[PDB]
Every structure is written in structure tokens, then in C-alpha cells.
């Protein structure tokens, strides 16, 4: 189906299918599938057309999903860079912002090895 421009896959239960929206995990999905009556066993290849319409206004009145949720994340990074905090002098360089050990580990903010 198609909830909000997000291309729900086929042959997969709604307990997992709403998780593919940027902004719904395993817990917010369980409360989308309770406020709109849809059970936690309904496959996506037999969704009723207006049952999706109930599914697409409880989200767009309470939650925040992508389009602007990506804009929530990267603009909150964009503020820390320009205020001059040390944590924004840490997103400039690809280093861990939460005081992690930068001596041996911390490949994830950096990248894989290069051995100079």
C-alpha cells in the first residue's frame, strides 16, 4: 500500500510494516495499531482502502514523520555548529560527541582504518 509516500511492502504484518516510516518504531507502531482498531496480525496485501485513511490522520495529527523530521534532525545539528559549542566543534570533525573513547575504538564517526 501507500500510507504517506513511504511504500509499504507486501506480505508482511502491520506490526512491522509501519516501522518502515521514518518516525515509527516498535512502540509507536503498537499505539497506531490500537487507536485505529487495526489488529497486530493484518497482512498488507489485504488492507481495506478506508482503513488506511484512519491510519493516515492519527499520525498526521499527533506524530512527526519524515519530510520535516529529517529537517528536525539536521537543523538541530546545524544550530550546534554555528553557536560555537564544543559539541558543534565535534560535528565539524567526525568525532564522537558524547565523550567516548577516541584512542582505540570510535571507527563509526570516523570510518574504517587507513594505516598511515
Amino acid at each position: 500500500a501507500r500510507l504517506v509516500g513511504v511504500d509499504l511492502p507486501r506480505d508482511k504484518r502491520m506490526e512491522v510494516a509501519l516501522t518502515y516510516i521514518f518516525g515509527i518504531g516498535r512502540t509507536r507502531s503498537n499505539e497506531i495499531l490500537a487507536a485505529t482498531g487495526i489488529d497486530r496480525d493484518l497482512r498488507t496485501r489485504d488492507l481495506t482502502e478506508e482503513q488506511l485513511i484512519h491510519l493516515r490522520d492519527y499520525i498526521e495529527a499527533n506524530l512527526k514523520v519524515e519530510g520535516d523530521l529529517r529537517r528536525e534532525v539536521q537543523a538541530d545539528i546545524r544550530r550546534k555548529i554555528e553557536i560555537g559549542c564544543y559539541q558543534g566543534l565535534r560535528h565539524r570533525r567526525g568525532m564522537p560527541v558524547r565523550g567516548q573513547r577516541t584512542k582505540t575504538n570510535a571507527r563509526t564517526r570516523k570510518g574504517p582504518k587507513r594505516t598511515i
Binding site: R79, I83, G84, C85, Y86, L89
Partner: protein
């Protein structure tokens, strides 16, 4: 102040320095050593000089530093590159 019960803790010896100047529209520079203090919006209008170990690095709390500590504006470790 990490917990919302006991309120935002800010050291007293800088609160008296900002309140004495905010009432009569005076924006000096303030030498301080209190990195642990949090920005109140009570001193948006004027600048600071926070410690790092060498020398008081100046900072101007502009509009959106609030919530964050003073000490996030003094990096205290230099590191300008291995090469």
C-alpha cells in the same frame, strides 16, 4: 538541574555580578571561573570570560546559547592536527 526537581543550578557569585548590571543597562565584561554554570536568559545582553587553564577565553551569549553551560564554549584541549 540535570533533574527538573531541584531547578537550574547556577553559581551565586556570577548571579550577583549579572543582576547588579542588568538593572541599570550596563554591559561590561565579566571575568569568571564558573564553567559549571548554566545560561539563564537573564544575561543575554553581555559577554563573559570563562576559564580553560591557560587564559580566559571570551564568549558572547547571543540568543540561543541558553540551556547549555558556559563551559561548552571553552574547548580546553587544543589539537590542531597530527601533521
Amino acid at each position: 538541574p540535570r533533574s527538573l526537581k531541584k531547578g537550574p543550578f547556577v553559581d551565586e557569585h556570577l548571579l550577583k555580578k549579572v543582576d547588579v548590571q542588568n538593572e541599570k543597562n550596563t554591559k561590561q565584561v565579566i571575568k569568571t571561573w564558573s564553567r559549571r554554570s548554566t545560561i539563564i536568559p537573564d544575561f543575554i545582553g553581555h559577554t563573559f570570560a570563562v576559564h580553560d587553564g591557560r587564559k580566559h577565553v571570551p564568549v558572547f551569549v547571543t540568543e540561543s546559547m541558553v540551556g547549555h553551560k558556559l563551559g561548552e564554549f571553552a574547548p580546553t584541549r587544543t589539537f590542531k592536527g597530527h601533521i
